[PDB]
Amino acid sequence: MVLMTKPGTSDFVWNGIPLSMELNLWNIKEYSGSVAMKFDGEKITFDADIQNLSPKEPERYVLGYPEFYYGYKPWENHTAEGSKLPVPVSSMKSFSVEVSFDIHHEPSLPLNFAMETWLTREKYQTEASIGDVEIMVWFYFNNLTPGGEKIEEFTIPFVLNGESVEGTWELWLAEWGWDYLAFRLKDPVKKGRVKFDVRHFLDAAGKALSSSARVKDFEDLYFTVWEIGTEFGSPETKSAQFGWKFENFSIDLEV
Ligand SMILES: OC[C@H]1O[C@@H](O[C@H]2[C@H](O)[C@@H](O)[C@H](O[C@H]3[C@H](O)[C@@H](O)[C@H](O[C@H]4[C@H](O)[C@@H](O)[C@H](O)O[C@@H]4CO)O[C@@H]3CO)O[C@@H]2CO)[C@H](O)[C@@H](O)[C@@H]1O
Numbered sequence: 001m002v003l004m005t006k007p008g009t010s011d012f013v014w015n016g017i018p019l020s021m022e023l024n025l026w027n028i029k030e031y032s033g034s035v036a037m038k039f040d041g042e043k044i045t046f047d048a049d050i051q052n053l054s055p056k057e058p059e060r061y062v063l064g065y066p067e068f069y070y071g072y073k074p075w076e077n078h079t080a081e082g083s084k085l086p087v088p089v090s091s092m093k094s095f096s097v098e099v100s101f102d103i104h105h106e107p108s109l110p111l112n113f114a115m116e117t118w119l120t121r122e123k124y125q126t127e128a129s130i131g132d133v134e135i136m137v138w139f140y141f142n143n144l145t146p147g148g149e150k151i152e153e154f155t156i157p158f159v160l161n162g163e164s165v166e167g168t169w170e171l172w173l174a175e176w177g178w179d180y181l182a183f184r185l186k187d188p189v190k191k192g193r194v195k196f197d198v199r200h201f202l203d204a205a206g207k208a209l210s211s212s213a214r215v216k217d218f219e220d221l222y223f224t225v226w227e228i229g230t231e232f233g234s235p236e237t238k239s240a241q242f243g244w245k246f247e248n249f250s251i252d253l254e255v
Pocket of ligand 1 (some may be wrong): 076
């Protein structure tokens with residue numbers, strides 16, 4: 001049983017898979033109230049009821065990203081032992097990720113249910129910079145838009161509640177200190193079960209970045225991690241009540 005009630009990181013093992021969970025309030029300067037993240041062997045849950053919020057940097061827009069992840073998160077220079085990542089993008093034949101989720105939140109709160117990876121030039125960087133790429137996949141959003149601008153749409157299949165469907169995904173792109181790409185599902189899902197192959201998003205990102213002057217040799221980058229969580233808040237958010245539950249998690253990485 002893992003229980004955290006303040007920002008921090010703990011490793012755990014779920015269905016035989018080594019993982020890290022981070023009660024991540026990375027852009028919050030100060031807060032009052034409670035946060036609690038728990039793994040009990042069957043599910044990971046997160047709940048927050050916080051007030052007196054202010055951002056460390058309003059230019060980054062969101063306030064936090066409570067999440068769990070598989071692999072090496074560059075910003076925290078951390079990976080649980082036993083992960084198959086990082087591996088070069090070119091060595092990934094397929095990477096299926098499956099998870100059930102139930103997300104709740106007060107109506108006005110900016111929030112998403114987003115998964116992501118960081119593709120870096122070296123295997124164990126401690127930050128992303130020019131030449132690196134952040135790729136997100138958003139299954140749900142409320143009062144929150146990705147960064148950058150919407151440039152394209154892609155039709156990418158996934159299995160929703162056990163049924164294969166064709167999702168329509170908008171691709172937003174931004175050139176900041178690193179390249180940011182976010183694929184946002186046009187029909188957001190707040191609760192359900194999803195299974196998909198991360199390779200389809202890598203393939204679409206490689207194409208979208210094929211003419212970039214910043215990103216070179218996309219397939220030689222290292223696919224470092226796979227994070228699953230909920231970003232939340234905006235620079236005007238003063239209090240936040242929300243939570244989530246993740247269950248039935250599995251992955252199949254073919255390298
Ligand atoms: O930086 C170190 C820190 O990173 C954390 O990971 C962050 C990424 O750094 C961050 O790029 C990403 O957040 C995006 C978010 O998806 C967008 O919704 C938001 O969009 C804004 C945009 O910025 C505005 O220009 C526009 O007008 O409005 C939209 C919203 O409507 O842009 C942000 C930029 O932050 O999210 C990742 C997770 O939060 C790591 O988790 C942490 O450990 C690191 O310390």
